[PDB]
Coordinates of C-alpha atoms and ligand atoms in Angstrom, one line a residue:
Chain A
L8 CA 0.0 0.0 0.0
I9 CA 2.8 2.4 0.9
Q10 CA 4.9 3.7 -2.1
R11 CA 8.7 3.4 -1.4
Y12 CA 11.3 4.3 -3.9
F13 CA 12.1 0.6 -4.6
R14 CA 10.3 -2.7 -4.3
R15 CA 12.4 -5.4 -2.9
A16 CA 12.4 -9.2 -3.7
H17 CA 10.8 -11.6 -1.1
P18 CA 11.1 -15.4 -0.7
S19 CA 9.1 -17.2 -3.3
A20 CA 6.9 -20.3 -2.4
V21 CA 7.4 -21.7 -5.9
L22 CA 11.2 -21.6 -5.6
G23 CA 10.7 -23.1 -2.1
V24 CA 14.2 -22.3 -0.6
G25 CA 14.4 -22.8 3.2
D26 CA 15.9 -19.9 5.2
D27 CA 18.6 -22.3 6.6
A28 CA 19.8 -22.9 3.0
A29 CA 21.6 -19.5 3.2
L30 CA 24.5 -21.2 5.2
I31 CA 27.1 -23.2 3.2
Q32 CA 30.3 -25.0 4.1
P33 CA 33.1 -24.5 1.6
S34 CA 35.4 -27.5 1.3
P35 CA 38.6 -26.9 3.4
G36 CA 41.5 -25.9 1.3
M37 CA 39.4 -24.6 -1.6
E38 CA 39.0 -21.1 -3.0
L39 CA 35.5 -20.0 -4.1
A40 CA 34.8 -18.7 -7.6
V41 CA 31.9 -16.3 -7.7
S42 CA 30.0 -14.9 -10.7
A43 CA 26.8 -12.7 -10.7
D44 CA 24.7 -12.0 -13.7
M45 CA 21.6 -10.0 -14.8
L46 CA 19.4 -10.8 -17.8
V47 CA 16.9 -8.1 -19.0
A48 CA 14.0 -9.1 -21.3
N49 CA 14.4 -7.6 -24.8
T50 CA 11.3 -5.6 -25.7
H51 CA 12.4 -5.7 -29.4
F52 CA 12.4 -9.6 -29.4
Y53 CA 10.4 -10.5 -26.3
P54 CA 10.8 -14.0 -24.8
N55 CA 7.2 -15.2 -25.5
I56 CA 8.5 -18.8 -25.5
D57 CA 8.4 -21.7 -23.1
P58 CA 9.3 -20.5 -19.7
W59 CA 10.8 -23.9 -18.9
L60 CA 13.5 -23.1 -21.5
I61 CA 14.0 -19.6 -20.1
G62 CA 14.7 -21.1 -16.7
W63 CA 17.0 -23.8 -18.0
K64 CA 19.1 -21.5 -20.1
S65 CA 19.2 -18.7 -17.4
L66 CA 21.1 -21.0 -15.2
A67 CA 23.1 -22.7 -18.0
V68 CA 24.8 -19.5 -19.1
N69 CA 25.9 -18.8 -15.5
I70 CA 27.2 -22.4 -15.2
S71 CA 29.2 -21.6 -18.4
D72 CA 30.9 -18.7 -16.5
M73 CA 32.0 -21.2 -13.8
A74 CA 33.3 -23.6 -16.5
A75 CA 35.4 -20.8 -18.0
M76 CA 37.1 -20.4 -14.6
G77 CA 37.7 -24.2 -14.2
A78 CA 35.5 -24.2 -11.0
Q79 CA 33.2 -27.0 -9.6
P80 CA 29.8 -25.2 -9.4
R81 CA 28.0 -26.0 -6.1
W82 CA 25.5 -23.2 -5.2
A83 CA 23.3 -20.6 -6.8
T84 CA 21.0 -17.8 -5.8
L85 CA 18.1 -16.5 -7.9
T86 CA 16.1 -13.3 -7.9
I87 CA 13.5 -12.4 -10.5
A88 CA 11.3 -9.4 -11.3
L89 CA 8.1 -10.7 -12.8
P90 CA 6.1 -8.3 -15.0
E91 CA 2.7 -9.7 -13.8
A92 CA 1.4 -12.3 -11.4
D93 CA 1.4 -15.5 -13.6
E94 CA 1.6 -18.7 -11.7
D95 CA 2.1 -20.8 -14.8
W96 CA 5.1 -18.7 -15.9
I97 CA 7.1 -18.9 -12.7
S98 CA 6.2 -22.6 -12.1
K99 CA 7.5 -23.5 -15.5
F100 CA 10.6 -21.2 -15.2
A101 CA 11.3 -22.9 -11.8
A102 CA 11.0 -26.4 -13.3
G103 CA 13.5 -25.6 -16.0
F104 CA 15.9 -23.8 -13.7
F105 CA 15.8 -26.8 -11.2
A106 CA 16.3 -29.3 -14.0
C107 CA 19.5 -27.5 -15.1
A108 CA 20.6 -27.3 -11.4
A109 CA 20.0 -31.1 -10.9
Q110 CA 21.9 -32.0 -14.0
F111 CA 25.0 -30.1 -12.7
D112 CA 24.5 -30.9 -8.9
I113 CA 23.9 -27.3 -8.0
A114 CA 21.9 -26.4 -4.8
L115 CA 19.7 -23.2 -4.9
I116 CA 20.4 -21.4 -1.6
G117 CA 18.2 -18.3 -2.3
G118 CA 15.1 -17.8 -4.4
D119 CA 13.3 -14.4 -4.2
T120 CA 10.9 -12.6 -6.5
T121 CA 9.4 -9.1 -6.9
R122 CA 7.2 -7.2 -9.4
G123 CA 8.6 -5.4 -12.4
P124 CA 9.8 -5.6 -16.1
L125 CA 11.2 -9.1 -16.6
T126 CA 14.8 -9.2 -15.1
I127 CA 16.6 -12.4 -13.9
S128 CA 19.6 -12.3 -11.6
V129 CA 21.7 -15.4 -10.8
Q130 CA 24.7 -15.6 -8.7
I131 CA 26.7 -18.8 -9.0
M132 CA 29.4 -20.1 -6.6
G133 CA 31.9 -22.9 -7.1
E134 CA 35.1 -24.4 -5.7
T135 CA 38.7 -24.4 -7.2
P136 CA 42.1 -25.3 -5.7
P137 CA 44.2 -22.2 -4.8
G138 CA 46.1 -21.0 -8.0
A139 CA 44.3 -23.5 -10.2
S140 CA 41.7 -21.1 -11.6
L141 CA 41.5 -20.1 -15.3
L142 CA 41.3 -16.4 -16.0
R143 CA 40.8 -14.3 -19.2
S144 CA 43.8 -12.1 -18.5
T145 CA 46.7 -14.6 -18.6
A146 CA 47.1 -15.7 -22.3
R147 CA 50.7 -16.0 -23.5
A148 CA 52.6 -15.5 -26.8
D149 CA 52.7 -18.7 -28.9
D150 CA 49.7 -20.3 -27.1
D151 CA 47.5 -22.3 -29.3
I152 CA 43.9 -20.9 -29.3
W153 CA 41.4 -23.7 -28.9
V154 CA 37.6 -23.7 -29.3
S155 CA 35.7 -26.5 -27.5
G156 CA 32.9 -27.1 -30.0
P157 CA 31.0 -25.8 -33.1
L158 CA 30.3 -22.1 -33.4
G159 CA 27.4 -20.3 -35.1
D160 CA 24.5 -22.7 -34.5
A161 CA 22.7 -20.5 -31.9
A162 CA 23.1 -17.4 -34.1
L163 CA 21.9 -19.3 -37.2
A164 CA 18.8 -20.7 -35.3
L165 CA 18.1 -17.2 -34.2
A166 CA 18.5 -15.7 -37.7
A167 CA 16.1 -18.3 -39.0
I168 CA 13.5 -17.7 -36.3
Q169 CA 13.7 -13.9 -37.1
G170 CA 13.1 -14.5 -40.8
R171 CA 16.7 -13.2 -41.5
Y172 CA 18.2 -16.4 -43.0
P173 CA 16.4 -19.3 -44.7
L174 CA 16.7 -22.7 -43.1
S175 CA 14.7 -25.8 -43.7
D176 CA 12.7 -27.4 -40.8
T177 CA 15.4 -30.1 -40.6
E178 CA 18.3 -27.6 -40.5
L179 CA 16.5 -25.5 -37.9
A180 CA 15.7 -28.6 -35.7
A181 CA 19.5 -29.2 -35.7
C182 CA 20.8 -25.6 -34.9
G183 CA 17.9 -24.9 -32.5
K184 CA 19.2 -27.3 -29.8
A185 CA 22.3 -25.1 -29.4
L186 CA 20.1 -21.9 -29.1
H187 CA 17.7 -23.3 -26.5
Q188 CA 19.9 -25.6 -24.4
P189 CA 23.6 -24.7 -24.6
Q190 CA 25.6 -27.4 -22.7
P191 CA 28.0 -25.8 -20.2
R192 CA 31.5 -27.3 -20.5
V193 CA 31.9 -27.9 -16.7
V194 CA 34.0 -31.1 -16.8
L195 CA 36.2 -29.7 -19.6
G196 CA 37.0 -26.6 -17.5
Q197 CA 38.0 -28.7 -14.5
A198 CA 40.1 -30.9 -16.8
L199 CA 41.9 -27.8 -18.2
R200 CA 43.4 -26.8 -14.8
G201 CA 47.2 -27.0 -15.2
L202 CA 46.9 -27.2 -19.1
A203 CA 45.2 -24.0 -20.2
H204 CA 46.9 -20.6 -19.7
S205 CA 43.6 -18.6 -20.1
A206 CA 39.9 -19.3 -20.8
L207 CA 36.7 -17.5 -21.5
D208 CA 33.3 -18.8 -22.6
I209 CA 32.0 -17.5 -25.9
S210 CA 28.7 -15.8 -25.2
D211 CA 29.0 -12.7 -27.5
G212 CA 30.9 -14.5 -30.2
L213 CA 34.5 -15.5 -30.9
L214 CA 35.7 -12.1 -32.0
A215 CA 34.3 -10.4 -28.9
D216 CA 35.3 -13.0 -26.3
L217 CA 38.7 -13.9 -27.8
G218 CA 38.9 -10.0 -28.0
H219 CA 38.4 -9.8 -24.3
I220 CA 41.2 -12.3 -23.7
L221 CA 43.5 -10.2 -26.0
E222 CA 42.7 -6.9 -24.3
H223 CA 43.0 -8.2 -20.7
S224 CA 46.2 -10.3 -21.6
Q225 CA 47.8 -7.4 -23.7
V226 CA 48.5 -9.9 -26.6
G227 CA 47.2 -10.4 -30.2
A228 CA 45.9 -13.3 -32.2
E229 CA 46.0 -14.9 -35.6
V230 CA 43.1 -17.2 -36.4
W231 CA 41.9 -19.3 -39.4
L232 CA 38.1 -19.4 -40.2
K233 CA 38.7 -22.8 -41.9
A234 CA 40.0 -24.3 -38.6
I235 CA 36.9 -23.3 -36.5
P236 CA 34.7 -26.3 -35.5
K237 CA 31.4 -26.2 -37.4
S238 CA 28.2 -28.2 -37.2
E239 CA 26.9 -30.0 -40.3
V240 CA 24.4 -27.2 -41.1
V241 CA 26.9 -24.3 -40.5
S242 CA 29.7 -26.2 -42.4
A243 CA 27.3 -26.7 -45.4
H244 CA 26.6 -23.0 -45.6
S245 CA 30.1 -21.8 -44.6
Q246 CA 30.9 -20.3 -48.1
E247 CA 28.2 -17.6 -47.4
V248 CA 29.5 -14.4 -45.9
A249 CA 26.4 -14.1 -43.6
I250 CA 27.2 -17.5 -42.2
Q251 CA 30.9 -16.7 -41.8
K252 CA 29.8 -13.6 -39.7
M253 CA 27.8 -15.9 -37.5
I254 CA 30.7 -18.3 -37.0
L255 CA 33.1 -15.5 -36.0
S256 CA 30.7 -13.3 -34.0
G257 CA 27.3 -14.9 -33.5
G258 CA 25.9 -14.8 -30.0
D259 CA 25.2 -17.6 -27.5
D260 CA 27.5 -20.4 -28.4
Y261 CA 28.6 -21.1 -24.8
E262 CA 31.7 -23.1 -25.9
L263 CA 35.1 -22.4 -24.3
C264 CA 37.8 -20.4 -26.1
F265 CA 41.0 -21.2 -24.2
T266 CA 44.7 -20.9 -24.8
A267 CA 47.5 -23.3 -24.0
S268 CA 51.1 -24.1 -24.7
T269 CA 51.7 -26.2 -27.9
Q270 CA 53.4 -28.7 -25.5
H271 CA 50.0 -29.8 -24.2
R272 CA 48.3 -30.2 -27.7
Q273 CA 48.1 -34.0 -27.5
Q274 CA 46.8 -34.2 -23.9
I275 CA 44.1 -31.5 -24.7
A276 CA 43.0 -33.3 -27.9
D277 CA 42.7 -36.5 -25.8
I278 CA 40.5 -34.8 -23.2
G279 CA 38.3 -33.4 -25.9
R280 CA 37.7 -37.0 -27.3
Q281 CA 37.3 -38.4 -23.8
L282 CA 34.4 -36.0 -23.2
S283 CA 32.9 -36.5 -26.7
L284 CA 33.6 -32.9 -27.7
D285 CA 34.6 -31.6 -31.2
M286 CA 37.5 -29.3 -30.3
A287 CA 40.2 -27.7 -32.6
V288 CA 43.2 -25.4 -32.4
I289 CA 42.0 -22.4 -34.5
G290 CA 45.1 -20.3 -34.3
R291 CA 47.9 -18.7 -32.2
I292 CA 48.3 -15.9 -29.7
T293 CA 51.0 -13.5 -31.0
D294 CA 53.2 -10.8 -29.4
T295 CA 51.8 -8.1 -31.8
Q296 CA 48.5 -7.1 -30.3
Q297 CA 46.3 -7.2 -33.4
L298 CA 43.5 -9.6 -34.2
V299 CA 44.0 -10.9 -37.8
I300 CA 41.4 -13.2 -39.3
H301 CA 42.2 -15.5 -42.3
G302 CA 39.0 -16.2 -44.3
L303 CA 38.4 -19.5 -46.3
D304 CA 40.9 -18.4 -49.1
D305 CA 43.5 -17.7 -46.3
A306 CA 43.4 -13.9 -47.0
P307 CA 43.8 -11.8 -43.8
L308 CA 41.8 -8.8 -42.5
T309 CA 42.4 -6.9 -39.2
Chain B
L8 CA 22.9 -5.1 -33.4
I9 CA 21.4 -8.6 -33.1
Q10 CA 18.2 -9.0 -31.1
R11 CA 18.4 -11.8 -28.6
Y12 CA 15.7 -12.7 -26.1
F13 CA 17.7 -11.2 -23.2
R14 CA 20.4 -8.6 -22.7
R15 CA 23.1 -9.7 -20.3
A16 CA 25.1 -7.5 -17.9
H17 CA 28.8 -6.8 -18.7
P18 CA 31.7 -5.6 -16.7
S19 CA 31.4 -1.9 -15.9
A20 CA 34.5 0.4 -16.1
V21 CA 32.9 2.7 -13.5
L22 CA 32.6 -0.1 -11.0
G23 CA 36.2 -1.1 -11.9
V24 CA 36.2 -4.7 -10.6
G25 CA 39.2 -6.8 -11.8
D26 CA 38.4 -10.3 -13.2
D27 CA 40.8 -11.8 -10.6
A28 CA 38.5 -10.4 -7.8
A29 CA 36.0 -13.3 -8.5
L30 CA 38.3 -15.7 -6.5
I31 CA 38.0 -15.5 -2.7
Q32 CA 39.5 -17.4 0.2
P33 CA 37.0 -18.2 3.0
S34 CA 38.6 -18.3 6.5
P35 CA 39.3 -21.9 7.5
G36 CA 36.7 -23.3 9.9
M37 CA 34.0 -20.7 8.9
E38 CA 30.6 -21.2 7.3
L39 CA 29.5 -18.6 4.7
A40 CA 26.2 -16.8 4.9
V41 CA 24.8 -15.8 1.5
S42 CA 22.0 -13.4 0.7
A43 CA 20.9 -12.2 -2.7
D44 CA 18.5 -9.3 -3.3
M45 CA 16.7 -7.3 -6.1
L46 CA 15.5 -3.8 -6.0
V47 CA 13.0 -2.6 -8.7
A48 CA 12.4 1.2 -9.2
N49 CA 8.8 2.2 -8.2
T50 CA 7.2 4.0 -11.2
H51 CA 4.5 5.3 -8.7
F52 CA 7.3 7.0 -6.6
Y53 CA 10.3 7.1 -8.8
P54 CA 13.8 7.6 -7.2
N55 CA 14.5 11.0 -8.8
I56 CA 16.9 11.7 -5.9
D57 CA 20.7 11.8 -5.3
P58 CA 22.1 8.6 -6.8
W59 CA 24.9 8.6 -4.1
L60 CA 22.1 7.8 -1.6
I61 CA 20.6 5.2 -3.9
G62 CA 24.0 3.4 -4.0
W63 CA 24.7 3.8 -0.3
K64 CA 21.3 2.4 0.9
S65 CA 21.2 -0.3 -1.8
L66 CA 24.2 -1.9 -0.1
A67 CA 23.2 -1.0 3.4
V68 CA 19.9 -3.0 3.3
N69 CA 21.8 -6.1 2.2
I70 CA 24.4 -5.6 4.9
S71 CA 21.3 -5.5 7.3
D72 CA 20.4 -9.1 6.0
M73 CA 23.9 -10.2 7.1
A74 CA 23.5 -8.5 10.5
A75 CA 20.3 -10.4 11.0
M76 CA 22.2 -13.7 10.6
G77 CA 25.1 -12.6 12.9
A78 CA 27.6 -12.9 10.0
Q79 CA 30.7 -10.8 9.3
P80 CA 30.2 -9.4 5.8
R81 CA 33.2 -9.7 3.6
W82 CA 32.2 -9.7 -0.1
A83 CA 29.5 -8.4 -2.4
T84 CA 28.6 -8.5 -6.1
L85 CA 26.5 -5.9 -7.9
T86 CA 24.5 -6.0 -11.1
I87 CA 22.4 -3.1 -12.4
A88 CA 20.0 -2.4 -15.3
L89 CA 20.3 1.3 -16.1
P90 CA 17.3 2.8 -18.0
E91 CA 19.5 5.1 -20.0
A92 CA 23.3 5.8 -20.5
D93 CA 23.9 8.4 -17.8
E94 CA 27.5 8.7 -16.7
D95 CA 26.7 11.0 -13.8
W96 CA 24.1 8.7 -12.4
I97 CA 26.2 5.5 -12.3
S98 CA 29.3 7.4 -11.1
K99 CA 27.3 8.9 -8.2
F100 CA 25.7 5.5 -7.4
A101 CA 29.1 3.8 -7.4
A102 CA 30.6 6.4 -5.0
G103 CA 27.8 5.9 -2.5
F104 CA 27.9 2.1 -2.9
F105 CA 31.7 2.1 -2.4
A106 CA 31.4 4.5 0.6
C107 CA 29.0 2.1 2.3
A108 CA 31.3 -0.9 1.5
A109 CA 34.4 0.9 2.9
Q110 CA 32.6 1.7 6.1
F111 CA 31.8 -2.0 6.6
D112 CA 35.1 -3.4 5.1
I113 CA 33.3 -5.1 2.2
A114 CA 35.2 -5.9 -1.1
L115 CA 33.2 -5.7 -4.3
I116 CA 34.1 -8.9 -6.3
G117 CA 31.8 -8.4 -9.2
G118 CA 30.3 -5.2 -10.9
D119 CA 28.3 -5.5 -14.1
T120 CA 25.7 -3.5 -15.8
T121 CA 23.2 -3.7 -18.6
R122 CA 20.4 -1.6 -20.2
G123 CA 16.8 -1.7 -19.0
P124 CA 14.2 -0.4 -16.4
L125 CA 16.1 0.5 -13.2
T126 CA 16.8 -2.8 -11.3
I127 CA 19.7 -3.3 -8.8
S128 CA 20.8 -6.8 -7.6
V129 CA 23.2 -7.3 -4.8
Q130 CA 24.6 -10.5 -3.5
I131 CA 26.4 -10.3 -0.1
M132 CA 28.6 -13.0 1.5
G133 CA 29.8 -13.2 5.1
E134 CA 31.5 -15.5 7.6
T135 CA 30.0 -17.2 10.7
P136 CA 31.3 -20.0 13.0
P137 CA 29.4 -23.3 12.3
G138 CA 26.2 -23.4 14.3
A139 CA 26.6 -19.8 15.5
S140 CA 24.2 -18.3 12.9
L141 CA 21.0 -16.5 13.8
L142 CA 17.8 -17.6 11.9
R143 CA 14.2 -16.4 11.7
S144 CA 12.8 -19.9 12.3
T145 CA 14.1 -20.7 15.8
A146 CA 12.2 -18.4 18.3
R147 CA 11.1 -20.1 21.5
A148 CA 8.3 -19.8 24.0
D149 CA 9.0 -17.3 26.8
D150 CA 11.7 -15.5 24.8
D151 CA 11.9 -11.8 25.3
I152 CA 11.3 -10.0 22.0
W153 CA 13.9 -7.2 21.6
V154 CA 14.1 -4.3 19.1
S155 CA 17.5 -2.8 18.6
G156 CA 16.5 0.9 18.0
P157 CA 13.7 3.3 17.3
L158 CA 11.0 2.3 14.8
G159 CA 8.9 4.5 12.5
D160 CA 11.3 7.3 11.5
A161 CA 11.9 6.2 7.9
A162 CA 8.1 5.7 7.4
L163 CA 7.4 9.2 9.0
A164 CA 10.0 10.8 6.8
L165 CA 8.5 9.2 3.7
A166 CA 4.9 10.2 4.7
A167 CA 6.1 13.8 5.1
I168 CA 7.9 13.8 1.7
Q169 CA 4.7 12.4 0.1
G170 CA 2.5 15.2 1.7
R171 CA 0.7 12.5 3.8
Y172 CA 1.7 13.7 7.3
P173 CA 2.7 17.2 8.4
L174 CA 6.3 17.6 9.8
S175 CA 8.2 20.7 10.4
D176 CA 11.6 21.2 8.6
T177 CA 13.3 20.4 11.9
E178 CA 11.3 17.2 12.5
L179 CA 11.9 16.1 8.9
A180 CA 15.7 16.7 9.2
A181 CA 15.6 14.4 12.2
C182 CA 13.6 11.4 10.7
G183 CA 15.1 11.8 7.3
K184 CA 18.5 10.4 8.4
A185 CA 16.8 7.0 9.2
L186 CA 15.2 7.0 5.6
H187 CA 18.2 7.8 3.6
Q188 CA 21.0 6.2 5.6
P189 CA 19.9 3.3 7.8
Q190 CA 22.8 2.0 9.8
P191 CA 23.1 -1.8 9.6
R192 CA 23.6 -3.4 13.0
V193 CA 26.5 -5.6 12.0
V194 CA 28.4 -5.5 15.3
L195 CA 25.2 -6.1 17.3
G196 CA 24.5 -9.2 15.2
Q197 CA 27.9 -10.7 15.8
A198 CA 27.6 -9.9 19.6
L199 CA 24.2 -11.7 19.7
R200 CA 25.7 -15.1 18.7
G201 CA 25.1 -17.4 21.7
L202 CA 22.5 -15.0 23.2
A203 CA 19.7 -14.6 20.7
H204 CA 17.5 -17.5 19.8
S205 CA 16.2 -15.9 16.6
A206 CA 16.7 -12.7 14.6
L207 CA 15.4 -10.8 11.6
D208 CA 15.9 -7.2 10.4
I209 CA 12.8 -5.0 10.2
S210 CA 12.5 -4.0 6.6
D211 CA 8.7 -4.2 6.1
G212 CA 7.8 -3.2 9.6
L213 CA 7.6 -4.9 13.0
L214 CA 4.3 -6.6 12.4
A215 CA 5.5 -8.1 9.1
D216 CA 9.0 -9.1 10.2
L217 CA 8.1 -10.3 13.7
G218 CA 5.3 -12.0 11.8
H219 CA 7.8 -13.9 9.6
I220 CA 9.6 -15.0 12.8
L221 CA 6.3 -16.3 14.2
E222 CA 5.2 -18.1 11.1
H223 CA 8.6 -19.8 10.6
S224 CA 9.1 -20.6 14.3
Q225 CA 5.4 -21.8 14.7
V226 CA 5.0 -19.6 17.8
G227 CA 3.0 -16.5 18.8
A228 CA 3.7 -13.1 20.4
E229 CA 2.4 -10.5 22.9
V230 CA 3.9 -7.0 22.4
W231 CA 3.3 -3.6 24.0
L232 CA 3.4 -0.5 21.8
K233 CA 4.4 1.6 24.8
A234 CA 7.6 -0.5 25.1
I235 CA 8.8 0.0 21.5
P236 CA 11.9 2.4 21.2
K237 CA 10.8 5.7 19.7
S238 CA 12.8 8.7 18.4
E239 CA 12.1 12.1 19.9
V240 CA 9.8 13.1 16.9
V241 CA 7.9 9.7 16.8
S242 CA 7.5 9.7 20.6
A243 CA 6.1 13.3 20.5
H244 CA 3.4 12.3 18.0
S245 CA 2.9 8.7 19.3
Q246 CA -0.7 9.4 20.6
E247 CA -1.8 9.7 16.9
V248 CA -3.1 6.5 15.3
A249 CA -1.4 7.3 12.0
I250 CA 2.0 7.4 13.8
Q251 CA 1.2 4.2 15.8
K252 CA 0.6 2.5 12.4
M253 CA 4.1 3.7 11.3
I254 CA 5.8 2.4 14.5
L255 CA 4.2 -1.0 14.2
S256 CA 4.3 -1.5 10.4
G257 CA 6.3 1.3 8.7
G258 CA 8.8 0.3 6.1
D259 CA 12.6 0.6 6.1
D260 CA 13.7 0.8 9.8
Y261 CA 16.6 -1.7 9.4
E262 CA 16.8 -2.4 13.1
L263 CA 17.0 -6.0 14.4
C264 CA 14.0 -7.7 16.0
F265 CA 15.5 -10.6 18.0
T266 CA 14.4 -13.0 20.6
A267 CA 16.3 -14.4 23.6
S268 CA 15.9 -16.1 26.9
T269 CA 15.0 -13.9 29.9
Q270 CA 18.2 -15.2 31.5
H271 CA 20.3 -13.1 29.1
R272 CA 18.4 -9.8 29.6
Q273 CA 21.2 -8.0 31.5
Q274 CA 24.0 -9.1 29.2
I275 CA 22.0 -8.0 26.1
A276 CA 21.1 -4.6 27.7
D277 CA 24.8 -4.1 28.4
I278 CA 25.8 -4.9 24.8
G279 CA 23.1 -2.4 23.6
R280 CA 24.7 0.4 25.8
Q281 CA 28.3 -0.6 24.8
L282 CA 27.3 -0.1 21.1
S283 CA 25.4 3.2 21.8
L284 CA 22.1 1.7 20.8
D285 CA 18.6 2.4 22.3
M286 CA 17.3 -1.2 22.6
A287 CA 14.2 -2.5 24.6
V288 CA 12.4 -5.7 25.4
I289 CA 9.0 -5.1 23.7
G290 CA 7.2 -8.3 24.7
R291 CA 7.3 -12.0 24.8
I292 CA 7.0 -15.0 22.5
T293 CA 4.1 -17.3 23.5
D294 CA 3.0 -20.8 22.9
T295 CA -0.4 -19.7 21.5
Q296 CA 0.4 -18.7 17.9
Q297 CA -1.4 -15.4 17.7
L298 CA 0.1 -11.9 17.5
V299 CA -1.6 -9.7 20.1
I300 CA -0.7 -6.0 20.2
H301 CA -1.4 -3.8 23.3
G302 CA -1.9 -0.2 22.4
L303 CA -1.0 2.8 24.6
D304 CA -4.0 2.2 27.0
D305 CA -2.8 -1.5 27.2
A306 CA -6.0 -2.7 25.4
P307 CA -5.3 -5.7 23.0
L308 CA -6.1 -6.4 19.4
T309 CA -5.3 -9.5 17.3
Ligands
NA1 NA1 14.2 3.0 -1.0
NA2 NA1 35.2 -30.6 -38.1
NA3 NA1 18.3 -15.7 -24.6
NA4 NA1 12.9 5.4 25.1

């Protein structure tokens, strides 16, 4: 009834978190990796889609931030501004969020909601041994640059849904899995402790996220578009420039881009096969701090 | 350029958090207390006020959640949806947020922003010995109910600002401090380990927050309005029913309501004086799970 400057989130019966869940016990000897995130609904492409998928992917993209640091995720908190009272929406969101948490053994230790334009905040916490974390700032000259899986599917699915690129129903059924349920590379990240010099997940595309590695590490890169892992659909259309743009800078892949000494090539390829991933070395970190991209004819651009 | 279903928050240069700040070392032997929160701007009473104060109080109210659990706050994360690019706004918010953090020795280990209707999410993390936490669910029959300081000032200030109750300029200068800069009772909370049976901060008013203690503890209460600590302004006007409503259920006090055995009365009063607080026993937790409130003439209502 009283109008305060702000509304605050309160415990949600649908999320069902006990107030004693706020206390956790970190494993002795471990450091904790912490990442907080905020997702705002896009009024120009509003998520009028299955709220189960919204919940599932909302956690997944935060689990991918833990993977990028080589951490074992253990706990999450959730706060949500809901634009109207809609019991069906929050129940379905919760189911998908909880499904993703179960798959990755994550406990929800806070779950609160309030009223307002749709906004979802997740904080995720995980464990790493001291000094064994992977950072974006620590890439080295003559590192191989690796990508953990195919790039461009999520962007291609999105382009097709938006009427921007023509896909068949069969092609869209293939790429759409990568859009709606990206699989965070949690076990890979833990396996890369001691082997990778730097890592970051690819959320805003290879150019942007490799770019963040280069800017924070004060180094450059040389990459080959032909070397980048590609799905069957993306590979088939990879002669088209619109598709090459998606491979290099499409959103929402949620693979890891990581760097490592050429000494560890064989061990890293072996890990990739052991986890059923399609990884490749795409290029090399250089001393000269430019990003040069060789297209399919091997001709460079900066 | 590409329209995705959601915009995600990215690291903010104004908040200036290094990517290595995401790794923390919990003190060996301690449990961690974690609280996440979301504040949504109220379009019916929009915060067109000093953003420094918005930043300061945004952290303060989360520090109060740590105080309520008896935890030593150590780390926070921050994510914000900003409704337009306004460098002045975020710089001033940041200054106030950081001022509050400095006062309580809290490190900011994540700071990200995005674009959208004004929404502020804070996650706060602190340390407590195992089993030494204070919860809302653990109040006992024949506990004294304590309040750590005066109630109603923030609500009275707000009512005056909204033209709902007449205050003089001098009276408003007094109550307004409680509205704009509530002081979280961090040291009190730590001092109440071993002494209090239950605790909760009073953010939505005594009736609501004592009410949450009663519902989670499965117990009742008997309280005396005359016993509640009152500021000089609130005390002066405490015969008026509109003011009695503010004392009992005004928002935004951020004092602690806690319960404790009558055996510890003297030690708890001594702590209150040692910290320069104006605390009082306001009543008793009862076996019968009603909330009865005695007004100034001692006549009850349920
Ligand atoms: Na407020
Ligand atoms: Na291939
Ligand atoms: Na999305
Ligand atoms: Na008094």
